[PDB]
Amino acid sequence: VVRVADTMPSGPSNSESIPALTAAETGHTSQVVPSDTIQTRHVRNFHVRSESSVENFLSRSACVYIVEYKTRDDTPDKMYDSWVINTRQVAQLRRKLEFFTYVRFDVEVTFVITSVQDDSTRQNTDTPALTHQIMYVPPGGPIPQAVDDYNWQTSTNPSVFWTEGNAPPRMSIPFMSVGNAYSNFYDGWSHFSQTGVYGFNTLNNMGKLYFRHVNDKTISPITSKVRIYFKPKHVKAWVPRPPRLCEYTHKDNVDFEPKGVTTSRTQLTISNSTH
């Protein structure tokens, strides 16, 4: 229970006190209250800065990527799909995270899996309930190269199984950084001779997910599309920075085209005219 500050009453004044005259050249934001310039009354103010905290602002589930894979194909690479894990391919969650330079949060991951029967000649089937497998590979593990590969056993890797029609699968993930905060921006190189790649692509290194159908080759193609929802919780955030004006281009760099600073007015003084 922390309220905002009340407005205290004031009266007429004539003295050498000057709250309105300041100097912003010291990098100092003036602490001028409205009871310093005009005559105000006493207002008991009951507003709470509640839904503006860093916890309430970021803790919302957000779609980060769409993953598509099928259940029977000629080519085996279209029967499973993978995704190198980053939060920088959807601009909403990325632009919400790029208010700060360093962040520290636990993650809550929820998958939403939907199935669509593809167009074929033999659509009149009776298919039992599909079961999907979502295997997480920590950085360095073995990579499956088919749906029938023996790396899908999950002897050590975390996994989750979902039968069609239930609630979405949900698990929590602790703070996984090797440093003390997830560096949203990294101004530096990868090699000590200042060559290689420039940006935050060196410090990503979070692992990658794998998706397949546990069932075998069916007699009709079905396209599965699973959506990943991240929810940052237990949040700490440091050293803020201005939001991005320009539209993004890629996931691995920060590059852009120059955009105008704001929308034009075509005049500079207001009037009671067509404004």
């Binding site: 050249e25 990098g27 921006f185 990294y186 101004d187 050293v239 920060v254 085209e257 600073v261």
Partner: protein, 252 residues
């Protein structure tokens, strides 16, 4: 009055007479690394007089049509004495700084500088899917220059003042520790900057800790008889510098 300020760090002293105040970071003054936040196990190196002292960078000339300048700062002090040598022989470095910028005029000149100290100023490129060479992000003590329009050079930073090379609004760039050099009241701008990074110590070549930016909002202007050449001189002093992991000289 409080407009006179004097700073002594080592064997170098700055006396100013039209200063404003001193911005100290995010309230934190630079201090050494404690044993609770320490990660490496061996004894650090604390020179404290041969290192913590003011180094004077190159002076840059400010015409009526100048747009801005930037310096990367664990890297602009590469060849400045025993700070640069202790950077070259160690693996882990950790320091705070004190950035003092001089620019003088008369009571007949007008203009206004903005001295920002931007942590993790990861800059864009001129061409979108292109790699930036290291000679354009930093050049040591020689400043790089913003441009007024959309620059499209090869292997270069996107140099436009209304995006600061980073893709944001340049008016919103005052969230960082900043001062103004207003030519009717100011003469100088002192910024004390502590160590801000995600790890307790870091290598001082592979990483760029922050970026000083000097951008003139109100353009320099004068009459038909006043002095034309107006320099801008930047002086920096590391604070609480310590070093870890001694090995041979090089960076590769």
């Amino acid at each position: 009055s409080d407009r006179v300020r004097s700073i002594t760090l080592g064997n170098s002293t700055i006396t100013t007479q039209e200063s404003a105040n001193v911005v100290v970071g995010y309230g934190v003054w630079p201090d050494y690394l404690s044993d609770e936040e320490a990660t490496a196990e061996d004894q650090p190196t604390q020179p404290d007089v041969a290192t913590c002292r003011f180094y004077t960078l190159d002076s840059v000339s400010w015409m009526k049509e100048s747009q801005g300048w930037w310096w990367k700062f664990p890297d602009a002090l590469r060849d400045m004495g025993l700070f640069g040598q202790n950077m070259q022989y160690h693996y882990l470095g950790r320091s705070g700084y004190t950035i003092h910028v001089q620019c003088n005029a008369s009571k007949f000149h007008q203009g206004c500088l903005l001295v920002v100290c931007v942590p993790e100023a990861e800059m864009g490129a001129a061409n979108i899917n292109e790699k930036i060479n290291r000679e354009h992000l930093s050049n040591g003590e020689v400043a790089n220059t913003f441009s007024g329009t959309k620059s499209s050079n090869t292997n270069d930073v996107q140099q436009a003042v209304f995006n600061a090379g980073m893709g944001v609004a340049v008016g919103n760039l005052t969230i960082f520790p900043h001062q103004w050099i207003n030519l009717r009241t100011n003469n100088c701008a002192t910024i004390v900057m502590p160590y801000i990074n995600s790890v307790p110590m870091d290598n001082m070549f592979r990483h760029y800790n922050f970026t000083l930016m000097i951008i003139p909002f109100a353009k320099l202007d004068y009459a038909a008889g006043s002095s034309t050449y107006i320099p801008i001189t930047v002086t920096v002093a590391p604070m609480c510098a310590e070093y870890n992991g001694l090995r041979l000289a090089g960076h590769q």
